[PDB]
Amino acid sequence: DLDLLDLNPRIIAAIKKAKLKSVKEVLHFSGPDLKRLTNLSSPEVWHLLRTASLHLRGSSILTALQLHQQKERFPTQHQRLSLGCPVLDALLRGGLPLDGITELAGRSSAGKTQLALQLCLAVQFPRQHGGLEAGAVYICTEDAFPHKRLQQLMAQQPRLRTDVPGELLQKLRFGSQIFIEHVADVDTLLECVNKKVPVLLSRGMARLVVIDSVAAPFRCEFDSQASAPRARHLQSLGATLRELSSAFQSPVLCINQVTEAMPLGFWDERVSPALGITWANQLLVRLLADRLREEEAALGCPARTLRVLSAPHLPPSSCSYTISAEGVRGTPGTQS
Amino acid sequence: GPQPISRLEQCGINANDVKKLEEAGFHTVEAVAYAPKKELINIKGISEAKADKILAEAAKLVPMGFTTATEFHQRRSEIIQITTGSKELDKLLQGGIETGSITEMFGEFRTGKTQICHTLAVTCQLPIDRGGGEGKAMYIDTEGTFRPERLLAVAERYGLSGSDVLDNVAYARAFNTDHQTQLLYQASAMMVESRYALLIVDSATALYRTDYSGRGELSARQMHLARFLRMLLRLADEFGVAVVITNQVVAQVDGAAMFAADPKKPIGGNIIAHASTTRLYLRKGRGETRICKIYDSPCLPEAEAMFAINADGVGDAKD
Ligand SMILES: Nc1ncnc2c1ncn2[C@@H]1O[C@H](COP(=O)(O)OP(=O)(O)OP(=O)(O)O)[C@@H](O)[C@H]1O
Ligand SMILES: Nc1ncnc2c1ncn2[C@@H]1O[C@H](COP(=O)(O)OP(=O)(O)OP(=O)(O)O)[C@@H](O)[C@H]1O
Ligand SMILES: [Ca+2]
Numbered sequence: 001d002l003d004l005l006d007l008n009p010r011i012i013a014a015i016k017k018a019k020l021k022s023v024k025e026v027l028h029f030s031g032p033d034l035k036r037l038t039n040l041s042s043p044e045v046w047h048l049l050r051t052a053s054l055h056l057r058g059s060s061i062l063t064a065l066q067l068h069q070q071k072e073r074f075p076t077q078h079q080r081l082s083l084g085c086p087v088l089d090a091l092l093r094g095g096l097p098l099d100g101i102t103e104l105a106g107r108s109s110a111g112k113t114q115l116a117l118q119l120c121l122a123v124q125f126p127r128q129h130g131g132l133e134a135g136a137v138y139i140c141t142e143d144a145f146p147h148k149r150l151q152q153l154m155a156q157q158p159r160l161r162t163d164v165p166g167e168l169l170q171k172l173r174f175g176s177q178i179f180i181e182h183v184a185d186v187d188t189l190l191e192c193v194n195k196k197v198p199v200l201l202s203r204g205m206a207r208l209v210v211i212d213s214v215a216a217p218f219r220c221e222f223d224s225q226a227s228a229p230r231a232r233h234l235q236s237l238g239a240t241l242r243e244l245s246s247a248f249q250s251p252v253l254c255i256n257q258v259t260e261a262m263p264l265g266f267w268d269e270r271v272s273p274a275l276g277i278t279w280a281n282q283l284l285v286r287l288l289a290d291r292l293r294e295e296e297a298a299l300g301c302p303a304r305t306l307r308v309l310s311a312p313h314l315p316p317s318s319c320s321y322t323i324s325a326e327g328v329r330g331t332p333g334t335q336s
Numbered sequence: 337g338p339q340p341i342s343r344l345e346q347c348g349i350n351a352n353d354v355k356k357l358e359e360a361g362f363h364t365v366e367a368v369a370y371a372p373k374k375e376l377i378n379i380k381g382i383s384e385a386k387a388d389k390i391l392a393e394a395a396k397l398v399p400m401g402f403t404t405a406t407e408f409h410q411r412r413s414e415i416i417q418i419t420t421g422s423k424e425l426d427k428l429l430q431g432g433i434e435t436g437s438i439t440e441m442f443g444e445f446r447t448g449k450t451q452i453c454h455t456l457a458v459t460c461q462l463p464i465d466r467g468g469g470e471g472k473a474m475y476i477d478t479e480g481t482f483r484p485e486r487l488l489a490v491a492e493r494y495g496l497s498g499s500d501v502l503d504n505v506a507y508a509r510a511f512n513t514d515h516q517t518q519l520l521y522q523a524s525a526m527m528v529e530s531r532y533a534l535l536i537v538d539s540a541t542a543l544y545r546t547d548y549s550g551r552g553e554l555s556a557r558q559m560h561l562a563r564f565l566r567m568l569l570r571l572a573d574e575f576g577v578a579v580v581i582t583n584q585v586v587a588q589v590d591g592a593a594m595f596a597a598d599p600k601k602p603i604g605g606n607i608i609a610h611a612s613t614t615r616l617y618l619r620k621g622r623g624e625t626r627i628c629k630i631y632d633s634p635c636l637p638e639a640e641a642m643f644a645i646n647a648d649g650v651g652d653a654k655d
């Protein structure tokens with residue numbers, strides 16, 4: 001790759017003597033390191049850096065007008081993934097973005113796994129109905145997969161999704177396009193996300209990744225006195241997930257647990273996301289499914305609320321929803 | 337990238353079959369390779385031998401080793417459900433206590449957790465057709481409230497042999513949290529030798545109330561509890577047994593009742609709230625009648641049922 005550059009043979013010979021391979025590891029080093037290794041003066045080092053940088057990044061120029069006008073060339077800025085419920089889609093103004101990590105947080109019985117299953121069902125709908133015509137990847141880190149709930153959801157799919165024409169759903173084979181994986185350790189999860197998910201995404205089998213819990217493996221090994229390795233692992237995992245999502249234009253959804261609050265935007269709230277600010281820096285859209293059980297429970301029905309914590313384009317708001325035999329349904333006319 | 341089905345032509349199939357596959361919605365090698373057998377053997381214009389050779393030739397290219405939802409629902413008829421001894425509770429739980437999971441029961445005193453554990457320790461030995469699991473039982477005790485006479489009384493109801501029933505139960509007593517964690521290694525070693533169908537811990541959080549005291553020791557207590565629950569999950573997954581644990585309650589004194597009489601919540605916090613799969617909340621009714629409610633479950637709606645504690649164990653309310 002080095003010989004592709006337009007440069008005099010002297011610097012090419014010096015680079016070859018310096019044990020260099022490609023432009024990436026040329027840009028990896030700095031000025032004084034290159035001076036020490038290659039024994040070159042400043043002007044030619046600057047020229048080599050300039051040429052390698054020009055080759056790597058090309059010479060194209062992009063404006064925001066092109067991003068706005070040309071919808072088809074840039075689907076990431078316009079294409080969204082539906083949640084299967086019009087109320088939830090209205091709350092999210094279309095659904096999940098294709099680039100970046102989305103997080104669900106909440107206590108037990110909030111309804112996170114039901115939403116994950118519903119999204120895994122609706123991802124493979126046709127394009128005009130919000131789907132992506134692709135499979136899904138499901139990773140479990142805490143317990144077994146909800147098989148009966150999945151079977152009921154596939155059975156009820158004609159009842160839940162009524163806008164889609166009836167003659168179109170029978171051709172959709174649901175269970176055959178969902179992949180299930182299971183891990184039991186932080187190292188196992190790292191190896192899985194490193195060398196299994198890219199294989200699935202490369203062949204076009206799936207275009208959606210769901211992790212049923214990221215806090216579960218981490219809350220078992222690292223104590224309160226080992227924050228540095230925990231932060232290193234969290235940063236590596238977030239970087240890899242973001243790289244994969246950007247490369248393959250596939251949404252990533254993470255399910256998270258909560259802790260007890262005993263400066264970060266949480267004052268009038270008793271629970272906060274578990275991992276901390278290090279993991280919170282890696283995210284794009286943050287939601288919070290919450291169930292108010294201690295109060296307004298004597299009315300006979302649970303009170304479930306989904307709230308948008310932060311997003312670059314979504315105002316803080318919340319809506320209400322219920323879980324029934326066919327799936328998750330949002331209550332009309334309740335957006336904050 | 338994706339591999340189109342055009343490679344099937346050079347793989348040794350005619351144009352008619354690939355045309356039929358295209359008309360059936362199949363358009364890539366991976367989908368055909370990972371398709372369930374019925375989906376491509378029930379179609380028109382195909383045969384069993386053709387489907388078998390198609391699978392054999394497609395598996396060469398696409399790397400296998402990924403589980404799919406169909407190949408996961410078809411294999412799981414192994415899941416056995418153990419009856420609790422009460423028809424109402426069986427109807428509420430839709431069969432009984434599942435295997436390969438963790439079930440938690442919590443409530444105040446004399447609600448009936450120990451009685452239910454005693455009944456299950458006998459009912460797990462019944463033949464599968466009768467509602468059992470055809471195995472032995474482990475009973476890890478942290479309070480000292482194990483009574484074999486209740487086991488004999490329950491065994492007499494089903495017409496079993498008392499000596500054999502008492503022979504097919506293992507017992508251990510835990511005196512602190514370290515001993516409680518240590519016993520699980522021997523539990524796995526013994527599960528390797530024989531066929532066990534149930535494991536019972538009673539209680540799973542009694543010793544954590546007093547081993548770690550004060551706000552200054554909460555973190556270590558939670559870490560220890562999380563490790564213990566992870567060990568339990570590994571055991572249940574590996575050996576395919578049913579794990580049943582019990583829990584205690586704490587009071588809510590912050591004056592947040594607002595028409596909620598005598599509020600109380602289980603101890604252990606979010607760690608035990610997340611680790612468990614199915615949680616049951618036991619209450620008390622009039623006389624010897626109790627009420628069981630579903631607190632949390634991935635595949636069950638919240639409902640209630642009424643049972644009773646009789647001279648022969650957990651059963652149905654008499655009239
Ligand atoms: N028919 C039904 N089938 C299954 N669940 C139902 C049904 N109807 C209502 N539900 C509710 O669905 C909820 C499922 O909870 P879910 O598995 O989503 O919890 P979670 O937020 O993932 O919690 P955890 O941290 O334990 O995993 C239960 O609280 C249950 O009451
Ligand atoms: N032989 C019997 N006949 C009828 N009822 C009995 C018999 N033995 C015990 N009981 C009932 O068992 C009840 C106690 O239940 P159990 O031992 O399961 O309590 P628990 O929930 O485990 O309590 P703790 O939290 O104190 O450990 C008593 O209230 C009593 O009515
Ligand atoms: Ca749970």
Ligand SMILES: [Mg+2]
Pocket residue numbers: 112113
């Ligand atoms: Mg869950």
Ligand SMILES: [Mg+2]
Pocket residue numbers: 449450481
């Ligand atoms: Mg007891």
